[PDB]
Amino acid sequence: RPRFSFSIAAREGKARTGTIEMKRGVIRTPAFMPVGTAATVRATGADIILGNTYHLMLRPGAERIAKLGGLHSFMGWDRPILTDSGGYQVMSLSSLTKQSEEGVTFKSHLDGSRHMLSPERSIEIQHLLGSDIVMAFDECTPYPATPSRAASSMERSMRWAKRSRDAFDSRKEQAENAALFGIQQGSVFENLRQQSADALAEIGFDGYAVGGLAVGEGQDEMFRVLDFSVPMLPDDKPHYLMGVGKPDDIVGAVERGIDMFDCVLPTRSGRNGQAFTWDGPINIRNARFSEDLKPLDSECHCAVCQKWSRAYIHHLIRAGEILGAMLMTEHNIAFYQQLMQKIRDSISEGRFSQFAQDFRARYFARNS
Amino acid sequence: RPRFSFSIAAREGKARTGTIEMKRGVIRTPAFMPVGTAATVRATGADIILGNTYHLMLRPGAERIAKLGGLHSFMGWDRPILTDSGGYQVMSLSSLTKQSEEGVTFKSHLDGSRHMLSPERSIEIQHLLGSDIVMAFDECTPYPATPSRAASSMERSMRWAKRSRDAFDSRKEQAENAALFGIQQGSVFENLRQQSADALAEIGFDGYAVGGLAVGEGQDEMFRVLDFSVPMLPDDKPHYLMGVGKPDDIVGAVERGIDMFDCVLPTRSGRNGQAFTWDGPINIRNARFSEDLKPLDSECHCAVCQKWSRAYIHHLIRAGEILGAMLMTEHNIAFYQQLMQKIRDSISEGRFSQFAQDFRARYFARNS
Ligand SMILES: Nc1nc2c(CCc3ccccc3)c3nc[nH]c3cc2c(=O)[nH]1
Ligand SMILES: Nc1nc2c(CCc3ccccc3)c3nc[nH]c3cc2c(=O)[nH]1
Ligand SMILES: [Zn+2]
Ligand SMILES: [Zn+2]
Incomplete structure (x- = not known):
């Protein structure tokens, strides 16, 4: 089995179907990826599950997960696992954070514990979790956002994506066995999305996520952004729309070229x-x-x-x-x-x- | 260690404090008993946890629990475990039931599966679950209830309590190692509560539950019923108020002689x-x-x-x-x-x- 090989078996309009081959198994696309849980048929089963990195960082902790054999042991799941970077919680928990170019430090806990995230630490944590698909450390830009706020956020995330790439490449075990996705940002603005897509493709990633959506914008606006954003990403690599969505959201996103999905809605x-x-x-x-x-x-x-x-x-x-x-x-x-x-x-x-x-x-x- | 020995160490008014000694450990009273879960700060820990029998009957099933070593293995808990009888769900799921003197059959599932509860089957299931404290099979009388409905319901439960006693006693391993509580019914009516207490004390039980409360009556009414109902129960045996309650409910119930509590509120x-x-x-x-x-x-x-x-x-x-x-x-x-x-x-x-x-x-x- 290869480290990461995306093959497109058939196409219709902008929609694609195919497979991502990895060392721990095959992911059929378009794919829905459910959130994995601790360990306590086939037609309803997934090919890959997700680790909510921020949650795992706090409970039971990334090092504790690694010592017990990583998320594949913790979740009783030998197939691929994708972990997020923390870039969503950078937004959703922003009032407990201090941000800088170096990264995001969270408010100290009452026991003196303190958590930080950066491109380097996020990749390290995702390595400790035993993740097969690693997400770059980004910021999910808040919505709505001024063009000014969207642009500064996106530019910083593109610098963080380069640092994420380098951190990932610096760990031979991770670089040889896992894959790394870049995350496009730019809010709802076409020019910023283009600048973000350009920056990610220059760096080079195994897959590309459309970030910064499913943050309350509504389906019409979400589809509108996908209409111009997905064709900006490399066609022959997987496209992962983070956080989407309702069943009809998923159908229309597939129509616009998306290959991978995650969403809180089934459980919520x-x-x-x-x-x-x-x-x-x-x-x-x-x-x-x-x-x-x-x-x-x-x-x-x-x-x-x-x-x-x-x-x-x-x-x-x-x-x-x-x-x-x-x-x-x-x-x-x-x-x-x-x-x-x-x-x-x-x-x-x-x-x-x-x-x-x-x-x-x-x-x-x-x-x- | 004795099978079941309730000792009162101190008394104030109607309130008591003491211990229930059983083979698997000691329960300090007044006690709060949280609902146990599948296994995945001593000052905040319980002495006993609860099995929700109706849930366990459906998933994963009583026999499957028994084959894997009972609830102590299932819940990773070596201390005492109390199981309910199903008598609360006889009420809360009544529209899916057919009731008779023999017992309560639930509506057939779409796979042809069918579950029934009776004094005999409830005791058998609680045995398979490995319960240390077994509840008699009762009906939590609906609230509000006419005196007529309350009386027929309570009289039927008192016949079911005798059958529960006999079923419990017919299994030597259960009778030698577990304990059995009778459940008082009679809604809010003093005379029916007295008849229920009398019927239970004639049969004889290790402990006595006040059933049929925490069904929406409100604290003033709940306290009023406890005022006359708890002194009807044998003084030298434990008194378990099912489903209660808010912190202030618990304090006032202790003031009225209650020794054991369970409540959905902490988790809800x-x-x-x-x-x-x-x-x-x-x-x-x-x-x-x-x-x-x-x-x-x-x-x-x-x-x-x-x-x-x-x-x-x-x-x-x-x-x-x-x-x-x-x-x-x-x-x-x-x-x-x-x-x-x-x-x-x-x-x-x-x-x-x-x-x-x-x-x-x-x-x-x-x-x-
Ligand atoms: N890093 C990142 N994650 C996002 C998620 C979480 C998806 C996730 C992945 C893995 C596990 C849990 C959740 C979003 N969810 C809704 N909208 C989202 C946007 C982003 C985003 O822009 N960046
Ligand atoms: N058998 C029975 N159970 C009751 C419960 C569930 C307690 C329980 C025990 C063990 C595990 C879970 C629940 C009640 N909860 C609120 N009011 C209640 C009344 C009764 C009652 O009259 N009879
Ligand atoms: Zn279904
Ligand atoms: Zn606390």
């Missing part, structure tokens, strides 16, 4: 009473489901829908049994994998344009 | 942005905490408060980091154990009446 929705189906999202707490004998989705092949009716899950949640939210979450994660499979099939068949139209017609009709 | 509050402190509950999402450098509670000895400021937890939750809710929950669980220790200390000193008054004055002033 599942714990808040929302399930994704081919007929759109459903709020299982609605009284219409109190005697609905059907599974959450009548096509879904996941383990939950083989066993559990809408009525059961509705009453579990109403009765305060946490099993209700677990089932919603497990179904949502599995539904996302079936969506990606239908997307990949349709591109391979040369019918992706028709799939996207049929998908949207049924998803938005809400005849659940 | 911690997942919904509410933390318990000596100055009352706080909603950590309030903007006052955005730059509050203090821990959740200034006295608390838990692991969270040694490390984490209100500001950090406030921003973690706002940023959607799941770690925020984990820290809130862990602090709430630990705070409950410190409350019980202070309660036990104060009774031992003969200063519980003054503790309760000081507790309430400070907790309700809300000067956090």
Whole structure:
């Protein structure tokens, strides 16, 4: 198996389907990558899972993870793992941070503990986590952002991407066995996105992420930015849209050339009473489901829908049994994998344009 | 070590403090018993944890738990474990049940699976789970309830309690090593509570639970029922108030003779942005905490408060980091154990009446 080899098997318009080959296995694209957890079927399973680096840094700690054999041991998962850099928390926790060109220092804890992130430390932490795909250390620019703020943020992130590249290359075990992605920034501004894409391609990366979206901008604006930003990235390398998104977000992003996705929505929705189906999202707490004998989705092949009716899950949640939210979450994660499979099939068949139209017609009709 | 020996070391008014000795260890009373989970600060630790039998019946299943060594192996917990009977879910999931004198059958699942609970099956399941304290199979009577509904429900549960006793006694390994509690019902009605207490004492149990409360009645009504119901139970045996409660609920229930407690609130509050402190509950999402450098509670000895400021937890939750809710929950669980220790200390000193008054004055002033 090669270190990192992206092959495109078929194309339709801007959409692609293919595979990323790595030493720990193959990732079918377009891919959805769910967040991995500590260790406690196939049609609903992922090819790669994610480590939330900031969380792991604080609990139980990167060195403790490394001593127990890295995230593959911790998560009981021998296939590829992608770790984030911390660049999202640089934004989302900004009021607890002090930023400089060197990096981001977080406020001291009450026990004197203090955490810092930089291009060098983020790569080191991702190495200690045993990550197969390493993200450059960036700043997810806040939204909305003035052109001035967006530009200074993006320029600093491009300097951090060069430092991330060099740090990664300085560790022979990491450079020989893992891969490194650069992250495009530039907010919603075309010229800044172009400058960011130019800077990343000069450095050179194994894959390219579209950063700074899924920060509250809304689908129309997100699609608009993807319309001009994705063609700026190298065509023959993977494109990873960070944080996106709803099922219809994912379909339209694939239509605009995205190959990889992650999103908090399957788990956040599942714990808040929302399930994704081919007929759109459903709020299982609605009284219409109190005697609905059907599974959450009548096509879904996941383990939950083989066993559990809408009525059961509705009453579990109403009765305060946490099993209700677990089932919603497990179904949502599995539904996302079936969506990606239908997307990949349709591109391979040369019918992706028709799939996207049929998908949207049924998803938005809400005849659940 | 004895199978089950309850000793009262000190008394003040109706309040008691003492110990329950069992083969797997000692339970200090009044006790708070948190819900146990699958295995992944002694002053904040419990003496016993709980198995949610209905959940475990469905996942992963009672037989699967038993084959892997029971709940002590499943939860990585060698100390005592109490399991519920299913009688709460007989109520909270009633619309998915068919009830008869024999027991309670739940609606068939989409895979043909079907679960039933009865005095015999509940005791059998609790045996397979490896429970040290077994609850009789009851019905948590719905609230509110007519006197007629309350009476038929309680009379049926008293027949089920006799069957539970016989089933428990029919398994020599369970009868020699575990203990069995009867559950008082009768809703808010004094005469029915008396009939229930009488019926249970005739059968004879190791401990006695006050069932049918913490179902929405409100503290004034809950205290009123405890006022006459707890003195109906045998004085020299433990009294377990199921589902209670808020910190001030627990103090007042101890004042009325309760020895054991369980409550969903520490975890439900911690997942919904509410933390318990000596100055009352706080909603950590309030903007006052955005730059509050203090821990959740200034006295608390838990692991969270040694490390984490209100500001950090406030921003973690706002940023959607799941770690925020984990820290809130862990602090709430630990705070409950410190409350019980202070309660036990104060009774031992003969200063519980003054503790309760000081507790309430400070907790309700809300000067956090
Ligand atoms: N580094 C970085 N991460 C982002 C994430 C987190 C994705 C992630 C990866 C791996 C694990 C968890 C989360 C975003 N989530 C929503 N919008 C996002 C934007 C960015 C961004 O611009 N930079
Ligand atoms: N069997 C039974 N359980 C109750 C519980 C669950 C306690 C429990 C024990 C062990 C684990 C979890 C829950 C109640 N919770 C709130 N009110 C309650 C009343 C009853 C009741 O009347 N009967
Ligand atoms: Zn499903
Ligand atoms: Zn604390």
